[PDB]
Amino acid sequence: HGKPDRLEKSRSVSIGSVLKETVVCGELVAKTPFFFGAIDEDAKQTALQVLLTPDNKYRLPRSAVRGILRRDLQTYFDSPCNAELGGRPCMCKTCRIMRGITVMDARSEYNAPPEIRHRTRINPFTGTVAEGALFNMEVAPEGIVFPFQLRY
Amino acid sequence: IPFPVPDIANDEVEYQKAVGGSKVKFPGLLEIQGAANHRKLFSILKAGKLNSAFFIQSDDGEWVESESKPTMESHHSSFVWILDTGSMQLRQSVKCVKDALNKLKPKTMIVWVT
Amino acid sequence: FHLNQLNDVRIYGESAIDNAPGAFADPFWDELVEFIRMLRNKKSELWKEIAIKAWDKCREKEMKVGNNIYLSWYWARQRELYDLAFMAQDGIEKKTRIADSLKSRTTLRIQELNELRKDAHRKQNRRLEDKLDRIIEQENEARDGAYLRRNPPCFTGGKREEIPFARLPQNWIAVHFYLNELESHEGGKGGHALIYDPQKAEKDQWQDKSFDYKELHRKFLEWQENYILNEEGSADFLVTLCREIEKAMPFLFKSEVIPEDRPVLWIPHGFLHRLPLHAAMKIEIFWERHASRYLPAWHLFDPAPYSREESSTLLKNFEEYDFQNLENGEIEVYAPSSPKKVKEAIRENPAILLLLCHGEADMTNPFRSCLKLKNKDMTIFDLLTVEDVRLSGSRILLGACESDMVPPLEFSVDEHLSVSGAFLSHKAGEIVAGLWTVDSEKVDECYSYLVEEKDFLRNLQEWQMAETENFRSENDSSLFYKIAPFRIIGFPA
Amino acid sequence: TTTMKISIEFLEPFRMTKWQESTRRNKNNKEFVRGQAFARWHRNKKDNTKGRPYITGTLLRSAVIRSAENLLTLSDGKISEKTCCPGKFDTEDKDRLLQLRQRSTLRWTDKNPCPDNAETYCPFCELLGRSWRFRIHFGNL
Ligand SMILES: [Zn+2]
Ligand SMILES: [Zn+2]
């Protein structure tokens, strides 16, 4: 858990009277199957599990979308952010943009059950399955459409 | 009376709005009695962005730097008025004009007022 | 100690320190500081003896740390021991030695690597050059917090002589700063200015002036954040900060502390490396009384002659603006300059080198601060890995914005690794650079005068004073924001 | 006093903190301090998980204060014919406060805050409650 700093110093900052809001609307369309991992501790039969809503719709969560936005912004600027949790807000160019961004959590109309994939690992010496290396995976199909809304 | 020692004035000066992390030309020398270029100059001096200095001819015949200020908006009959954006460049060019009169940096201009 | 056998406390404590382990990762070093704090909190007179011996041992063994990575990881945790020894010690000169031993310990090692690369190049020891490149690469990785797969290599040090304070020339004054965090946190003043006048009899040569730095640090942080977000709308906060300098350090404008019209050498500490101390504002500005010069640390003091080469160069990549005064000087101008041209000029040891380009200080990692050259940025990392560099005694004028700025963060050790600092680590004679954004017209008109009148110390002061008379007529914050950023770094012969 | 009924409608799934014993609801518990921006669980009786969720009025108050800072920034401090001072966010007995502000405060004037013994306080200081006694009281949701 992030620990806030109680010796942090106080600052007043102007930012100015000029302030605009931009709204972007669209769709995010699955061109491949996809996997947002989330395990139910009470469901043991399946090893790797997909995130669903309580009524079994597929969910594109806000947390993942923000994480991917921050990752791609650091890819654009080509400079990683090193800041730790806690203390005064980070002033790097990515954090300043992310502090203006808002994104909707989204879900699908499609609600059919996921696929189950077999997966295994091969021992390279013998050419046969390694000890213990049999497992299975839930996968969400391609073609699902999610609403997308971003604001800055 | 035409401006003495005209050899030393610049041909043109070009002032430009500065930049960091919009041009105006002048012919380098003006002669004036106590109109486009005059209004252009008046615009810059009202903007407040040119340093300047003056010479005055003392009774012994030599030009001396005047103790005076060109406030916005004596017996003497002619003035040499030197202007530059750079304070230190002005202090150099005023020396050059003192030597010329009693026997320039690129952004310096001269005005001869009569 | 619990048995009040104080002579045996002295004996065992001395025996423990004398046999201390080399590695600062060892838990011994935590226990020693806890022991000294226990003695101090019980108000035992033993605490001052033990603290000074502990500092001397710690100082002895910092010398054996092999690279900046281990230096940042493990030695950085021993700062509190220097605070304690600084409080134990009563002699002002010895206080100054304790203070100075904490400063610019990473820059010293970068300087020694730059020296090593010279010898490798002239002897074509290629495999040593690769080792030198690996250490800088791993240091760059460590400042990004990355995991290091291989143990970084170790380098023995240069001939680190202890510089006598007497080597300051007779007409100067030196001000040494120290910010004692422990004393500050306990509610004391915590800020100290140690002032050396070499013209007085030896018993009167040192003064120790102390001040409270909490509010000055707050106003610094406030200006810094407003600068990052606005930026030139921060001019009023700059004026506020410069007035706060004089509020915190009223002794700067007293002749019995700093005698009349003698030049001053600053040796800052902590966030004081970031401030324009030359612009402290009583209206009266400090630069009207004294000319100023900066060093990161006193053990870096090394006067050498200016370069003999009858050649100078101006490199420009700045096409928005016409530098009419610089481009009509006697120095030839090449534009638009690429990093290859900069690398070419840097191995000719020019008398004067001018660079006119945009610049940008990084927000996270110092090594990513850069100059904006034609088709590619040149970073501090690039400068510190140029194979062939010859700048001993050169004079360097950086027209770039933020060329003397560092990230808005506090690193684990005292350090100022700006672009100007990078050039100083290559043994440049003196560097002129900007603490924040610089105006192109002011750059033109200042550097033209400096190039014409080749005495930077006096000529920068004359330029600053000549601009101040236009400040007084209206006290415009925007004009002060344009005069203030320039400062000189280094101390030539 | 006059009462203003309010309701909050969520458009997304909201987050909720894990319930903790009263010996652990203090500044030295990282888990409790991290959860202070979420909803809460209330147990009807401490030895049973049976309960229901709720939101503190303090959290809504903090969000409203941030919103008021932004609005006053856009109006250059004007609200009707009145003008707001910078507010006051400075407490001498720090250890009273479970949380301390880490972000910077938005600025719209150089003027100092209202005196602590004044009779008349600007609207922002009324909203801060600076004018057992409340002027604007936020209940739980
Ligand atoms: Zn960041
Ligand atoms: Zn108020």
PDB file of N, CA and C and ligand atoms in Angstrom, chain D residues 85 114 122 125, ligand 2:
ATOM      1  N   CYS D  85     -11.099  35.005  -0.464  1.00  0.00           N
ATOM      2  CA  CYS D  85      -9.694  34.932  -0.091  1.00  0.00           C
ATOM      3  C   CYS D  85      -9.185  33.514  -0.360  1.00  0.00           C
ATOM      4  N   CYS D 114      -8.760  35.399   5.697  1.00  0.00           N
ATOM      5  CA  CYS D 114      -9.563  36.158   6.645  1.00  0.00           C
ATOM      6  C   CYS D 114      -8.995  36.004   8.060  1.00  0.00           C
ATOM      7  N   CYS D 122     -15.550  35.347   4.023  1.00  0.00           N
ATOM      8  CA  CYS D 122     -15.922  35.239   2.624  1.00  0.00           C
ATOM      9  C   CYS D 122     -16.549  33.873   2.348  1.00  0.00           C
ATOM     10  N   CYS D 125     -14.588  30.661   2.965  1.00  0.00           N
ATOM     11  CA  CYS D 125     -14.372  30.319   4.365  1.00  0.00           C
ATOM     12  C   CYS D 125     -15.654  29.842   5.038  1.00  0.00           C
TER      13      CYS D 125
HETATM   14 ZN    ZN E   2     -11.970  33.982   3.445  1.00  0.00          ZN
END
